[PDB]
Write a protein that binds this DNA or RNA. Structure first.
Lengths: 38, 188, 135, 140, 169
RNA sequence: AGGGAAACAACCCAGACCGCCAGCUAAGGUCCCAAAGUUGUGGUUAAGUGGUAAACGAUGUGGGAAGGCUUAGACAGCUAGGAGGUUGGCUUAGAAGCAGCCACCCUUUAAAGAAAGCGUAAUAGCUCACUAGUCGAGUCGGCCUGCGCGGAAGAUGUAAC
RNA sequence: GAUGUCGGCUCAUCACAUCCUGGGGCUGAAGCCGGUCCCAAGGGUAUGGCUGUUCGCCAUUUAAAGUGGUACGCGAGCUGG
């Protein structure tokens, strides 16, 4: 995870999810583009 | 080009602000040298779709207040300076025997085939569009052609260097103000 | 930074920043522009920082007009200084910004490159800005 | 229907009979078998036979084969420049090969300026920008 | 299009029990699938099964779709044996408990509940068989966190696919 | 002074001559502490927002304007894909569609990018517009506006209704 | 018409922006090591040479020698350099 105040889709495989009230990003390619809240 | 209009029997500041924020309307006036001025309400959504057109300001606009229809040229426009939308519209009567100055855009046709661009490295700098003209309503230029094909690097096209289409008086040329229209110059 | 070459006086008052920007609100030289939508204050190194962001993100050509000009001098009392011993001396310069003031203008680029260049420009400025085209 | 791009084609040219350089590729598109291999009739001797270089194709169901106004094979035929065959190890990292645009008159016999650009000085820009993206560039 | 208006198309060997509020699915190769179908839901009957909502909400719009999905994999698991092929290192399957020594000093023994069953078709592999995909996937995940896949050389228990991120130092 | 703002010279309402177990109001209020609507009609809001807050970031949701993609069958998901010289370029274990140094139209004729980039740190596998036979259709990208969500960490004890 | 300093001693008490110990994610994390960022305040968290010292510099340890609020906690508890 990577905690910001501004999560973005860093590449094309990134996907933004509201999970449990948190704006997370899941990446199917690289787990370094996983990022927590924003 | 047609807009629908109304009668507007109530004038002032707080009246105009209520038109803009409650009724969704836009004030306006219609005037010419031959009739009394008439205040008019219009719709912001219905005039903002005219302002989307490129040939909006240099064109006959039919305007229907009641069952009475007038020919109308938009000669003024007010606009909210921050957000940007029309407040009062302020347009002009059109008669067939009248001098009728309007603003006409410049249109800058073939800029890829420019001998100061292809061979010599340079870019086109339009310093001016929206030239004001002086013309009868029979000839309304929706556009004015600006040919930028036979112009070299470092060279400047002025108001004398282009065409006046069939009895159109470019206003600044009728003074000693030969303005610079476009420009070809070296890059940075 | 942008400073005047010389001014008639050295210190102004504080003053106020009221009204909308009726003058300075049109894209008068370029095709695309960065208009402010909130009032504030640009401090002549904000102005140069957004300027360098623009001139570095273009990379190819264009012509950039910087429309705002800081002519208002702003003073400062230094630290460990009791108040009221004469007005403090000038430190920097400031353009007073109203809603509607066109800040920067560009021609010669595409609309997409202009938009993502004024995004870089707006990232460095303490104002709320927007993107406008030539009317 | 079927809507996607960055479609990915690679097989040995001409004959689609050797499969396991790729093997079972598809399972999404849904066309038949009888519809590639009848147009080997007129013209050889022009456009580099057999070596794996793809057409990047669009499909219709008329079955009387159609060729474009196009003789530029441009994807999978240009690793070797001196005669050695394999690929680059990791991009931008392993700087050992010094490379610019020097010797081209072997191919500048038929420059074929029609399908490259508008004139001949821009055809210098195409060979000045052709293979430049895994370990070479062009100043000269 | 949306999935709740896609009917279930159950085969003949799914003898259901309509009860008014909750569905009860019986059959051969597994049975006894009960599900408390929620309040905002319609369960009607035909030659095939199909679902529709009750009221204009965005909350029940997700619920009718998940109810069709739950009964889809519920019916097709009453029909067929939901599987998973987890590939690991060393599997001494013996009975209702599973025995695996994943690189520690202890071989961690894993027991299997009612429903599920695990087999030993090969040397490095586990095939699972169960009637609901919920518990099949849950016991596959419960095997998986015994040892997650190390990227570098590659050790641990995997899935059937190969999308494991491998790195080189 | 009085009433309200919990408590609170200076804020709001209102200027106390005295008595009354009379009435009507102002500010502020009407579930219980505590006097008065658990009042009515139409909405919004799921955070306990209300009941602390900025740049900026979000398929949170309501509303209102607009575009084209819209059954000759769209936006993601299953039943072919795959060339007619040549070693198309200062390099010689290895320099195709991601190096300091860039990119636009001549085939046998119904077919299409000398590339905006993840692969086997690379070769032999493979994700983006499809001139279509094939499952049968209503969805995709931005603007203005209402209310919300993160950004938001402190010291004696909930402890900013 | 007096709220008596800095430091040390003695005794503390809270926060968490965590020093150790505990649980994780990413990695330019092969492993011993790490870097950074989350979660966590339960318990722990040096002795000295110098100087009045707080601090600091050294010496030697430790798993670690945390950062801060408390009238820069604490003199009707001590000292008084």
């Amino acid at each position: 995870m990577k905690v910001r105040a501004s999560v973005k889709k860093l590449c094309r495989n990134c996907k933004i999810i509201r999970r449990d009230g948190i704006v997370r990003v899941i990446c199917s390619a690289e787990p370094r583009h996983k990022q927590r809240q924003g | 080009f047609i807009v629908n209009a109304q009668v507007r029997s109530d004038l002032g500041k707080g009246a105009s602000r209520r038109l803009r924020r409650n009724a969704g309307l836009v004030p306006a006036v219609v005037y010419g040298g031959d009739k009394e001025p008439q205040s008019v309400t219009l719709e912001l959504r219905e005039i903002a779709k005219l302002l989307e057109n490129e040939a909006a300001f240099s064109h006959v606009i039919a305007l229907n207040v009641g069952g009475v229809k007038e020919t109308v040229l938009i000669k003024a426009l007010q606009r909210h300076p921050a957000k940007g939308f029309v407040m009062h519209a302020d347009f002009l009567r059109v008669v067939a025997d009248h001098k009728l100055t309007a603003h006409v855009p410049l249109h800058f046709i073939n800029e890829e085939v420019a001998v100061g661009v292809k061979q010599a490295g340079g870019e086109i700098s339009h310093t001016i569009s929206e030239v004001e003209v002086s013309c009868l309503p029979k000839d309304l230029p929706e556009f004015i052609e600006v040919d930028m094909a036979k112009v070299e690097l470092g060279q400047i096209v002025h108001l004398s260097d282009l065409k006046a289409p069939k009895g159109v008086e470019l206003v600044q040329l009728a003074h000693g103000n030969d303005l610079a229209v476009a420009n070809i110059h070296a890059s940075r | 930074m942008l400073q005047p070459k010389r001014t008639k006086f050295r210190k102004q008052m504080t003053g106020h920043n009221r009204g909308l920007a009726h003058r300075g609100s049109k894209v008068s030289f370029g095709e695309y522009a960065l208009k402010a939508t909130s009032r504030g204050r640009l401090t002549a190194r904000q102005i140069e920082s957004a300027r360098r962001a623009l001139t570095r993100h273009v990379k190819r050509g264009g012509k950039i007009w910087i429309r705002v000009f800081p002519d208002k001098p702003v003073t400062k009392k230094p630290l460990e200084v009791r108040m009221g011993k004469g007005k403090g001396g000038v430190e920097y310069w400031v353009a007073q910004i109203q809603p509607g003031k066109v800040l920067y203008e560009i021609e010669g680029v595409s609309e997409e490159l202009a938009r993502e260049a004024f995004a870089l420009a707006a990232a460095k400025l303490p104002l709320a800005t927007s993107f406008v085209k030539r009317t | 229907k079927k809507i996607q791009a960055y479609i990915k084609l690679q097989v040995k040219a001409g004959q689609a009979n050797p499969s396991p350089p790729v093997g079972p590729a598809l399972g999404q598109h849904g066309v038949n078998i009888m519809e590639f291999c009848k147009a080997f009739n007129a013209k050889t001797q022009g456009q580099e036979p057999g070596l794996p270089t793809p057409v990047i194709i669009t499909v219709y169901s008329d079955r009387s084969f159609t060729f474009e106004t196009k003789s530029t094979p441009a994807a999978v035929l240009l690793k070797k420049a001196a005669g050695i065959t394999s690929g680059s190890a990791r991009p931008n990292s392993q700087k050992v090969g010094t490379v610019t645009r020097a010797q081209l008159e072997e191919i500048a016999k038929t420059k074929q300026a029609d399908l490259t650009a508008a004139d001949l000085d821009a055809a210098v820009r195409t060979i000045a920008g052709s293979a430049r993206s895994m370990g070479l560039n062009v100043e000269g | 299009s949306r999935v709740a208006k896609n009917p279930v198309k159950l085969p003949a060997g799914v003898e259901i029990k309509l009860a008014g509020q909750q569905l009860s699915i019986k059959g051969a190769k597994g049975a006894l699938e009960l599900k408390v179908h929620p309040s905002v839901e319609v369960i009607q009957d035909s030659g095939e099964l199909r679902f529709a909502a009750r009221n204009g909400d965005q909350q029940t719009r997700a619920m009718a779709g998940t109810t069709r999905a739950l009964v889809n994999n519920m019916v097709v698991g009453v029909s067929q044996g939901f599987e998973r092929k987890l590939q690991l290192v060393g599997v001494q399957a013996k009975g209702q408990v599973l025995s695996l020594s994943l690189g520690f000093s202890h071989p961690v023994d894993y027991e299997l509940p009612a429903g599920i069953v695990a087999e030993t078709p090969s040397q490095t592999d586990i095939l699972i068989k169960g009637i609901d995909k919920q518990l099949v996937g849950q016991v596959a995940a419960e095997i998986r966190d015994f040892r997650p896949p190390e990227p570098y050389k590659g050790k641990g228990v995997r899935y059937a696919d190969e999308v494991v991120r491998r790195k080189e130092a």
